[PDB]
Amino acid sequence: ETPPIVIDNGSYEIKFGPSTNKKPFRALNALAKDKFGTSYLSNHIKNIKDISSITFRRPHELGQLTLWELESCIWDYCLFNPSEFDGFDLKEGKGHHLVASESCMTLPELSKHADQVIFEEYEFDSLFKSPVAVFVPFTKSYKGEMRTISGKDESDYHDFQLVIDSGFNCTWIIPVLKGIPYYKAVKKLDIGGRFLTGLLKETLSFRHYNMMDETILVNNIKEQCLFVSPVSYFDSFKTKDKHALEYVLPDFQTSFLGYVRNPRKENVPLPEDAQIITLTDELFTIPETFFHPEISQITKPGIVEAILESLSMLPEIVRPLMVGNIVCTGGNFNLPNFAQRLAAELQRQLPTDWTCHVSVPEGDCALFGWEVMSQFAKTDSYRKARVTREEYYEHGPDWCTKHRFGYQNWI
Amino acid sequence: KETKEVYEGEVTELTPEDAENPLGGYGKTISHVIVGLKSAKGTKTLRLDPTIYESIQREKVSIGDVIYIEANTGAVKRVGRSDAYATEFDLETEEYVPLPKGEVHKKKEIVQDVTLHDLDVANARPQGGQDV
Amino acid sequence: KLFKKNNQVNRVDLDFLNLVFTLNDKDLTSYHAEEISKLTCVKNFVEEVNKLRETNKQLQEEFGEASFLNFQDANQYFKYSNKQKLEGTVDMLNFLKM
Amino acid sequence: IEGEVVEIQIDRSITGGHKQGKLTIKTTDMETIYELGNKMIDGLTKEKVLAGDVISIDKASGKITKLGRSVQCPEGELQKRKTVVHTVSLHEIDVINSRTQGFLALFTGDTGEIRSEVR
Amino acid sequence: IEGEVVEIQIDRSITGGHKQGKLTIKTTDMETIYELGNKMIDGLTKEKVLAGDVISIDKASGKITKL
Amino acid sequence: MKALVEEIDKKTYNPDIYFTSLSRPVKRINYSLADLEARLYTRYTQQEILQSDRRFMELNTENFSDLPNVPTLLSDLTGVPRDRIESTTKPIWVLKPETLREIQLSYKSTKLPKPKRKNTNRIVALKKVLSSKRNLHSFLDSALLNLMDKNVIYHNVYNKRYFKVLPLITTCSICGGYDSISSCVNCGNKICSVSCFKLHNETRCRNR
C-alpha cells in the first residue's frame, strides 16, 4: 500500500483522510448524550433536532487524551465505515501506513498507550507521528496559494520556521529550526475556543437569559458572526453603533440552526414570530481577549508577550530569521482581520531594523495543515523517517516513543 | 530650500550614563544619554549628548510621552502623552495624541518662499534669548 | 492653538542659515570667526566616506545581487548578516554627509 | 464633568505612588467616584476647594469652574459632550497674531498699525 | 595662543590649594607643555574643557576661548 | 477670586496632606466571622491570581456537571492543597459499558473488522491499555512520569520574564465604555453611564 492514511487528532474535531484525496473527511471527536438519555455518535450530533440540553463527554482532556477506548471506538467508526464516507473504506489495514499528529508536550505514558494501540491493535506496517508544527517546513515542497502579509508595510523543506498554532484546546507557539522544534522556547497560550465559547456564554448570560446550557448554539454564533477589530478596541467601540449584527434564534419546531441578519442587508424580508438577539459589543469584545486579557478580567500575559518571550529564549542569530517566515494554522485564525492585527501588533514591538512577515494560507487553516501533512508523505524523506513494524517489535514500547517520537530527546 | 532630519516617537526607556572617570574638568557629569523611541512602523534606540538630554529634562518628559527631536537645531519638543495610556486615569489634565507614523528617522526638505522684506523685519527684531 | 496648527512642515527655521546674523556680534569676535571658518573639518568626512565605500562596493558588486533581496534574505544563515551589514553601512554612509 | 463634591481626599507623596486621591462627584441622576490624575491633584490643591460646592471640571482644558454652592442643583449625568461657539471678528483675530498678547491690545487701543502681511 | 589640547591634569585632594596642574597643547608642527597658575586654574574651570579639544587663550588678558 | 492670605494652624495643618469632607442611614457592617477574623489576622496579588485561575477554569469548562470537578484538577495543576484554596475561593460520568454497547449499536450498521487473537503478554498490556477509565488526575498522581518531566511539561512552558508588553486597557464592566471611566463607591468597579449604574446596583454588586 503506497499511499498512507493522514489522521489529525484534535480535541474539537479529528480530520482523517487518504493521501490521494485533496481534502480531509471532517469527523467530530466527542460523545454527546441528550437529557432523555439518548446517546448519538459524534458525526450524528448535527442530525439531532433538539440542541437545547446536551451533555458533551469526550476522551480528549485539556492536556491530552487519557482514554483510548472511546477514541479507539471513534477510530473504528471513521475508518471502518465505507458507507459513511463516500469512496473511502478499509478492509483490514495491515499493509497501510499511518501518519498521526499529537501534542508536543503530551505525556510519555499516554504516548506509549498510543503506540501500543495503533501498532498492535490496528496492525499498521509503519507509522510516524509528529506535531503539526513539524510538517510546516514542508509547505515549500509543493506550490500552493498562501496569502502573505508584511507587518512593517503600511532539500525542499526550509530550516527556519515559526509556527503559531491556535486551537480549540489551546494555542501553541512552536519555533522550528532545521526542521526540528526548539522545545525550550515553546510557549503555551491558555486562550482557546473553549474560553471564547464560555466567555460568550457568560456575556450573553448577563445581557440576556443564560445560554450556558446550550453550547452548540453559542458555538455556531461564535463561528458565524464573530470578527476581530482591524485597528483598535477604541475605534471599533466608537463604531459599535454603526456595525451591529442581529441573530435570530433557531426554533426547534422550524429551523435547527439560526441565521445571521445584517440591518444593511434587505435580502431577508420574511417575517417570523421568533425574537432577535442584538450583538454589538460582544462582536469585537470576544476576540480582543488574545491581545488584551484585561477585557476578560484574566491575568494571562497575552499572545504577543508569549511571542516576545519565545524569541527571547532563541539564539540572537535565529531571532531575525524566524520573524521573517511565519505560518499560522488552526481554526482560531479563520477569524477575519486577526492575521493583519497580529502582524501589526507584533510589528509595533519589534525593532526598526527587523522586518516581520506573516504568511496565512487561504481558506481553512486546518485543511491546509492536513494537505501539507499529506504532502509530507510524498516527500522522499518520509521513506527514511518512517519506522518499520519489526523494529518496533524488537525495541521496547518505551523506546520508540521516548527516542524518535519524544520531545525529551530533542531537548 | 533646506533639509531637516527628525527622530520622533514615544519614549520607551531613557537612562543616563555617568562616567566614573573624574577627568578633572567637572565634578559630576554624564558621558552620554540613551533614549529609546517607539513608533508604529518600528522602534529604535538613540545615543544623545548631555545637553540635548538637559533640554528633555527642561521639557519634563516622562516614560510614555511622545517627543520631537530635530537633528539640525537640536531642539526637543514634547507633543503630548501617548493615546493608549489615557485610560490609566479617570481625570487627566494632559492632552493625548496617537503614536507617530513612520519608522523612526525621517528626511524632509522645506521649499518655503519668503520675501526679502520679511527677512529684513525678522532681521530687525530678534526672537531669540531668554533675557528679562 | 488654531494658528498653532502644523507649521514646521512648510516652515523654515531661518535661524539655521545665518540670516539672523545681526545677533553674532554679542558673543562672537572677528578673528575667531575668520580662523573658525578657515579651520573647517571638511574633506575629512569625504575620506571617511571613501574608505567605507570600498567595503560597501565589495559586498554590493559580489553578493549585492541577492543581498538586499527579500527572497534570499527570507531564510539564509550567511546572507542575512551580509544584508544587515550593507544596510548598516549605508546609514553610516549618509549620516557622515548629513 | 460637573456636580457636587461631597468628599475629596488627597494624600502626600509616598514610595508606592506619586500621589493618591479620590474625589466624589455627586449628581442627582448618577453618583460616581474618580481617581485623580496627579496634576489634577495640583489643580485641586492649587485653588482651595471646600466640600459641598458645585464645580465644573474641564478634562481637555485642565481647569476647574465653580458654578456655586450646595444656589444650584445637580441637573443630571456627570459627563456631557457640548459644543462651544465663539463669535470673533476679523480684527480680533488680527490683533492677537501681531502681538505677544494681542487681546490686551484690543481693549487698550495701543494696537498701532498692524502689518498688512499679517492680515 | 591657539592649539589642540591633549591632556589636562589638576590636582585637588592630593595636597590642596592650586597644586599647579599642567596641560599639554598640541599643534601639527609643534607640541609643548605649559604650567598653569592659580588664577588660570580658576579660569579653566569656567568653560570646562575635557581636553580632546581645540581652544585659544589670549596672551594679554588670559581669556579662554573654545573653538 | 484666589485669596492671597490663608489662615493656617501650626499643629493641625500640614502641607503634605489636604483633606476635605462634608429611613435611618446605617454604615454597612459585615457580620461574617471569617471576614472579621480574616481582617484582624492579616504585580497582581496572589489571591486574585487564584481567583483568575478558578474563574478561567470555570469559564473553560463546557458542561455544568463538570464544573465542580474542575477546581480539583486546577488545584492539582497549581500545587497548593485542594481543600484550602477551594474553600477560600468560591467559583463563579464519561464512560459506561452500556453506553459503549449503544455506540456499538451506532457503528454496528457498517463495519469490516477481522477478529484474530492469541494470548501474549503484549496482548495483556493491550487489554490493560484499551480499558483505562482513568482521569488525567490519576495519570498525574502516577509515578510513571518524572518530576522534571512534569516541571518541563507544565511549569516550564509558561513565559517567565514578560508579564505585560502591550499597554493596559480599562473598560466598563457592563458595555465596556471607555469614554467615561467612573469607579463605583462600594465595590470600586468602573461604570460608564447612569443606565449601566442602575443595572449594576442590582445583580452585579456583591459588596453593597
Ligand SMILES: Nc1ncnc2c1ncn2[C@@H]1O[C@H](COP(=O)(O)OP(=O)(O)O)[C@@H](O)[C@H]1O
Ligand atoms: N469559520 C470559523 N470561524 C470562527 N471559528 C472557527 C471557524 N472554523 C473553526 N473555528 C474554530 O476552530 C476550532 C477548531 O479547531 P481545530 O482545527 O479543530 O483544532 P484542534 O486541532 O484543537 O482540533 C473550533 O472550536 C471552532 O470554534
Ligand code: BEF
Ligand atoms: F488540539 Be487542538 F489543535 F487545540
Ligand SMILES: [Mg+2]
Ligand atoms: Mg491540531
Ligand SMILES: [Zn+2]
Ligand atoms: Zn457601560
Ligand SMILES: [Zn+2]
Ligand atoms: Zn457597586
